[PDB]
Amino acid sequence: SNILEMTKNYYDRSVSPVEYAYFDQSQNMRAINWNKIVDEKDLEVWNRVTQNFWLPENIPVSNDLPSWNELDDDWQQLITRTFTGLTLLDTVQSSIGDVAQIKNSLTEQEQVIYANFAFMVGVHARSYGTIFSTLCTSEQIEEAHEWVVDNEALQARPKALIPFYTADDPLKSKIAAALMPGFLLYGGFYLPFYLSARGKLPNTSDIIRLILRDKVIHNFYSGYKYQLKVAKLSPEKQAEMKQFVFDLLDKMIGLEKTYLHQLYDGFGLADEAIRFSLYNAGKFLQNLGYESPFTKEETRIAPEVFAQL
Amino acid sequence: SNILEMTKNYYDRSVSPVEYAYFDQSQNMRAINWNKIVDEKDLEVWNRVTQNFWLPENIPVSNDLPSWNELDDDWQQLITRTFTGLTLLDTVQSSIGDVAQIKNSLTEQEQVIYANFAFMVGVHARSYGTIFSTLCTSEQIEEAHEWVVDNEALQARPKALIPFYTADDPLKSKIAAALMPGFLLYGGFYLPFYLSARGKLPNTSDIIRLILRDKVIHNFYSGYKYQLKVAKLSPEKQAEMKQFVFDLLDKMIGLEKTYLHQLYDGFGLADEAIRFSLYNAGKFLQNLGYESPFTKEETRIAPEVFAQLSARA
Ligand SMILES: [Cl-]
Ligand SMILES: [Cl-]
Numbered sequence: 001s002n003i004l005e006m007t008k009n010y011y012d013r014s015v016s017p018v019e020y021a022y023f024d025q026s027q028n029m030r031a032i033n034w035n036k037i038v039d040e041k042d043l044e045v046w047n048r049v050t051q052n053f054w055l056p057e058n059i060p061v062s063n064d065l066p067s068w069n070e071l072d073d074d075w076q077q078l079i080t081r082t083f084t085g086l087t088l089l090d091t092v093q094s095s096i097g098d099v100a101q102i103k104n105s106l107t108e109q110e111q112v113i114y115a116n117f118a119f120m121v122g123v124h125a126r127s128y129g130t131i132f133s134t135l136c137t138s139e140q141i142e143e144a145h146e147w148v149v150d151n152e153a154l155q156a157r158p159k160a161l162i163p164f165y166t167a168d169d170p171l172k173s174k175i176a177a178a179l180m181p182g183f184l185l186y187g188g189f190y191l192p193f194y195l196s197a198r199g200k201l202p203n204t205s206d207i208i209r210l211i212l213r214d215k216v217i218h219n220f221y222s223g224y225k226y227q228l229k230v231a232k233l234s235p236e237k238q239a240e241m242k243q244f245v246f247d248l249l250d251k252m253i254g255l256e257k258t259y260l261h262q263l264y265d266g267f268g269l270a271d272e273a274i275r276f277s278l279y280n281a282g283k284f285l286q287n288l289g290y291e292s293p294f295t296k297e298e299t300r301i302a303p304e305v306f307a308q309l
Numbered sequence: 310s311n312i313l314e315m316t317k318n319y320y321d322r323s324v325s326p327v328e329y330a331y332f333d334q335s336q337n338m339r340a341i342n343w344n345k346i347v348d349e350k351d352l353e354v355w356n357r358v359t360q361n362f363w364l365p366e367n368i369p370v371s372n373d374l375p376s377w378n379e380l381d382d383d384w385q386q387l388i389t390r391t392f393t394g395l396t397l398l399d400t401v402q403s404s405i406g407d408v409a410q411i412k413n414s415l416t417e418q419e420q421v422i423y424a425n426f427a428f429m430v431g432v433h434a435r436s437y438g439t440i441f442s443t444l445c446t447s448e449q450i451e452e453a454h455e456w457v458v459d460n461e462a463l464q465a466r467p468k469a470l471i472p473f474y475t476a477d478d479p480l481k482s483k484i485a486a487a488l489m490p491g492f493l494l495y496g497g498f499y500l501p502f503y504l505s506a507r508g509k510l511p512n513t514s515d516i517i518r519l520i521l522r523d524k525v526i527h528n529f530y531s532g533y534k535y536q537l538k539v540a541k542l543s544p545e546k547q548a549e550m551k552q553f554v555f556d557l558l559d560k561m562i563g564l565e566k567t568y569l570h571q572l573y574d575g576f577g578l579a580d581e582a583i584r585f586s587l588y589n590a591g592k593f594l595q596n597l598g599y600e601s602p603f604t605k606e607e608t609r610i611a612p613e614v615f616a617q618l619s620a621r622a
């Protein structure tokens with residue numbers, strides 16, 4: 001043999017601890033190796049999300065009190081309800097969705113990045129608390145929580161995704177994980193961007209932009225990992241998974257439209273919020289490596305809302 | 310009829326998502342409420358660990374190159390091996406241990422705090438990589454990974470804890486979760502502090518102190534939550550769980566002693582490393598609400614080493 005291999009590489013005869021815990025005990029465990037990185041995209045994402053660390057205490061929400069006080073009681077209630085709705089989706093993602101992805105990682109660094117995502121989506125949920133602490137009465141806060149618990153249209157959306165997280169199909173779990181930052185919160189994010197475009201709650205929209213700076217990377221990353229895994233399947237299994245993605249998005253769009261109509265119809269924002277939602281549904285499909293089937297007309301966003309985005 | 314409830318509060322007729330996911334789908338989900346906090350200890354812990362956010366890039370490890378170059382290949386190999394061993398334990402805790410705690414939380418905020426722990430223990434593991442990048446050859450780094458995979462005494466320790474994380478007993482899972490930051494890494498932390506007490510690798514010891522600033526809160530918090538849950542058991546079942554804690558710690562001390570003898574005997578550090586380990590075994594039990602059964606002599610630490618430990622980050 002012209003190539004003498006005296007030792008066998010440690011990496012190919014060991015498993016990460018999470019693999020050992022849940023899947024394969026046939027070999028000993030390897031420590032994470034940050035010196036020999038399998039996918040440089042992992043290091044790029046790790047560096048960006050850790051460099052982007054923030055806490056809601058960094059933003060002076062107190063400065064929004066004047067513009068908040070200009071808003072009628074029904075608008076204040078709409079914002080508190082919408083944001084408590086987004087708090088629920090962040091609680092789902094932080095406590096179930098992100099941590100479920102860790103054991104299904106392609107790489108060692110991916111396990112640590114999803115730990116960062118779980119923590120930072122927790123910070124997202126905590127930030128709404130900070131906004132409420134500054135702007136809302138105890139009565140407004142308590143009412144919003146009651147409204148969320150009793151809103152069947154709102155509950156339907158996380159109830160549809162959670163089963164994919166707790167089941168044993170890692171690709172369907174990954175699609176659910178991408179759908180949360182990629183699609184489900186944009187219907188809600190429409191409201192602060194609408195308000196900011198008209199000069200209301202500027203400091204609140206600064207928190208929303210810090211949340212979105214994280215969520216756009218979360219969607220990209222989960223989509224990137226989905227694409228690497230699905231590419232290794234047969235043409236038939238790739239066709240079945242593409243069908244599953246479109247079928248699940250179709251269902252979630254149906255549930256989102258029902259919820260957004262209920263949330264916004266009284267205010268005249270439902271049509272605009274749904275177009276904003278469908279635009280992001282298109283970007284969600286693109287980040288999974290599929291083509292958007294959505295029309296220019298049904299995805300149209302006002303320039304000044306896009307500007308806030 | 311004086312006491313009839315006409316209005317049921319949202320909290321007591323809903324569940325957190327993680328409860329809905331793993332335990333009960335009969336009730337609708339509530340969003341986390343940071344405006345009405347059940348346990349003020351959760352907010353204090355959240356505020357401290359988030360305020361204590363750090364990255365290993367923050368510490369100029371390259372300033373250790375002079376003192377690193379003074380150490381012979383045997384000492385450099387010992388440090389790379391020990392630290393890759395600590396990297397393995399941090400990987401176990403970040404990817405399995407902390408994650409496993411979330412669904413067993415007593416409060417909403419506890420679910421988010423364990424997400425923070427999973428991330429920050431990930432940062433701990435990443436910090437050894439930063440030290441290696443700066444100080445070690447590619448040969449030293451690869452050798453240490455091979456050594457960790459093939460070291461049965463090293464492997465035995467995490468292999469003993471992982472089953473508690475993957476099993477359905479949340480109190481045993483919690484004890485394991487406290488044992489990792491409370492006890493299992495201190496045998497390894499002895500080495501950097503031994504060296505920095507003699508003015509070697511001072512910047513490395515700053516990284517270890519930033520890691521310890523997190524791990525002491527992790528141990529306290531998991532111990533605090535253990536004590537709240539064990540208090541809800543019958544006195545009979547409280548006695549059983551106390552016996553399990555002492556039996557598990559006894560077993561883990563056995564495995565740690567074997568590993569530290571194998572790691573250090575050649576460098577004459579084994580006895581002092583084990584004393585340092587048992588000192589922290591004592592602190593671990595105290596944080597679970599039990600008395601340390603260890604003597605002053607069994608737990609003696611040289612004052613110059615204790616000065617490196619107790620020094621604030
Ligand atoms: Cl998200
Ligand atoms: Cl995410």
Ligand SMILES: [Cl-]
Nearest residue numbers: 402430489490
């Ligand atoms: Cl730890």
Ligand SMILES: [Cl-]
Nearest residue numbers: 407426490527
């Ligand atoms: Cl921990």
Ligand SMILES: [Cu+]
Nearest residue numbers: 121181215218
């Ligand atoms: Cu996210």
Ligand SMILES: [Cu+]
Nearest residue numbers: 430490524527
């Ligand atoms: Cu820890």
